[PDB]
Symmetry: C4
Subunit: 237 residues, 4 copies
């Protein structure tokens, strides 16, 4: 189960890094005088097509991996992950269609993303039924992060071309990935032996501070990525 928690963390980390890099590069191209390094739009179209294809492929891979099998109910918990992966694949297909046919509005993709996020949150609001207070609290924090990311995505859809909103969305995605890794490390330690008790208000207090530190680290990572891309553009110019 540790791998099952860790894989989405890597996926979200990669997606957030790619989106942040794309947004910074687009802003730099807008600031750019001409098509010397980034003005070409065919490169952007190819990057969008590749992004959609990779999202669809990752969704399919996650769906296949989660489903162990290639009038009753069994292993019902995996169907939630199945549905989440299906929604992300629908988002990828919608992005591919939008960037393939010019008639469809560009922002539609963003809308789809928001929808997917909301769906995920809804599922995570009911995925846990029993279990201990620590697990419940951690899953509620994950739900809060997903809901905030969905709200930010919807607001970005409403307001066209907001670089700060895109950076905030990327930071939230990175925070979600880091928190998924934290969930994995806490619930299923790789050391083999349990380390954190499931009933400790001290653990809850420490987890709150850890979540805040993760958010701060994601903000710092976004800033460092912006600085690195600026340095690379300056060196290229």
């Amino acid at each position: 189960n540790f791998r099952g928690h860790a894989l989405p963390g890597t996926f979200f980390f990669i997606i957030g890094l790619w989106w942040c890099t794309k947004s910074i590069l687009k802003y730099i191209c807008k600031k750019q005088k001409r098509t010397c390094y980034l003005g070409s739009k065919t490169l952007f179209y190819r990057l969008e097509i590749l992004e959609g294809i990779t999202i669809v492929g990752m969704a399919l891979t996650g769906m296949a991996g989660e489903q162990f099998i290639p009038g009753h109910w069994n292993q019902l918990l995996g169907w939630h992950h199945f549905t989440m992966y299906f929604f992300f694949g629908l988002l990828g297909v919608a992005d591919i269609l939008c960037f393939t046919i010019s008639s469809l509005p560009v922002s539609l993709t963003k809308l789809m993303l928001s929808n997917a996020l909301f769906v995920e949150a809804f599922i995570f609001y009911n995925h846990t039924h029993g279990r201990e207070m620590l697990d419940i609290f951690v899953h509620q924090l994950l739900v809060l992060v997903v809901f905030l990311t969905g709200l930010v995505a919807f607001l970005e859809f409403l307001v066209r071309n907001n670089v700060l909103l895109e950076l905030l969305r990327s930071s939230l995605i990175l925070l979600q990935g880091s928190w998924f890794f934290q969930i994995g490390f806490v619930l299923y330690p790789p050391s083999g032996g349990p380390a954190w008790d499931l009933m400790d208000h001290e653990n809850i207090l420490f987890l709150t501070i850890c979540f805040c530190w993760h958010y701060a680290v994601t903000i710092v990572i976004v800033g460092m990525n912006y600085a690195f891309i600026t340095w690379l553009v300056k060196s290229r110019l």
Copy 2:
């Protein structure tokens, strides 16, 4: 009671399909060069008048059907449906008046719609008092859907001419209708014998996934309708 649950499902399904078709046709007419096929505005006015008349008629029919009868309280539950139908009839009358007199703003109708939705949600927040956890959970999901549809309608009223928002509202209406049908099928099976226990967390988990699948199906239906209307316009041209 199964018929009483099923009839609003059909009404909402028809209304959502009609609204989606109208929005797609309006967008196509805007993209159209001239009045060759859809540029005429008298057709739109006639369609709006017919839509208002049909909404008023359906509200009256539902009110009459719900009321079995043509200092105490009896059959108090039916008065809630009476009030909901009355509010929908008020929305229809307001739409007719707005499209009859040019002085009134067009968006007023939208506002009225939002109000009606909110009222419905409020009623459904108190309609159920006793009953089992499964029924309570299903009615709470219905309340959530109605509240989200009302918020989307209000936002559409605030922001003029958003095709994506109109499509989202139509998809939400279709989801509401499908969930009404699901409520009917679960609470009062047509088979005569009970099938689903009223106390099962497994049933709750399955219902969450069923709701997500219904939302996905509605999105797919909206996409297919858009494709079909595009095909029809291309064939006509």
Copy 3:
């Protein structure tokens, strides 16, 4: 206590009627070709000054009436009404200052109004501590109405010159007044003898429908007032 509940109902009813009439007259003046009947702005300034003076006077009168008296705590419940009246008086003073000095923005008054409403809601969220479920439910409905009115006022402040928003705010004020009268009639019947039991889910269900009917009646009253003002303008022209 029945008079203490009824007086704010009359105040809110009068204020809502005056605001609705003012908004409709302003819209008609905007539609008007010239200063034949309503184009004069000195009339609007005089009306605003009179409105501010009347609001301040009503706030002072309510404060004086509520306070029976012209290291411990006694009659602490009246201080809440004192604070609400003080906030409304501050709103009136702010409106007078804004319409007296041209430097201050016009929308500031609206903002103040919103603030006052929010404060009222907050107080009504803690005014009731004990008491029965019926009283708690009715006060919670009043809190909901006040919160919705405050949100509508804030949104109107954000978006300049929205006639529909002003009409919605007026309808909400009228609904608040009617519900205050309902609270008075239910809690302290004028007949002398108690009529409604304080513990009845049937009473709760009836009160929900009564609230919906009050909202519908307020909407109808707003529509009738608009029609009457249109008739009067047409007759004058």
Copy 4:
């Protein structure tokens, strides 16, 4: 602990006064005809640099003072204050960087501020675990104030150059400082002996009215500051 509560109150009071003065001066400069008294922009740049430096210094001082020390958990409560001070220092550093490099958007600083506020609220939602109902209620009021201030800051970030929004944010900051002082005076009286019982609904009712009075006092202080700055500008001119 009384000093630990009181110091942030003084910090917030000073920051709110400075921000209100800056906003009023900026509005007066905009109304000003030329650079006679305030048109110079180098003064604004120097003031912004000084504000950032002072914010960073105060954050560092608070962090050092809170940390008594220059596989277990001890004094975990202080890490929350450490994190809050770290976030405020990050806000100050971001403001300094934004006013140092022209490429970065100006509103970014505002965004950062909002983020910090939200983080603080989150921490204060979990800082208290045990304790009595009075302390819980007071901390919940503080959480509400912080959340409202964060929402106002985010809305100000969304809508450029709103003087009323800036004044509202300053008033909320002053209210937060005054309520911090109230918390200090109630929880840890300077008289040495306890005065307020920790379990009294009368105390809760009095605290609600005290909070409303604090809000009113902050509004009056903002108005007086505006009047004083107007008088000073008129005298200088």
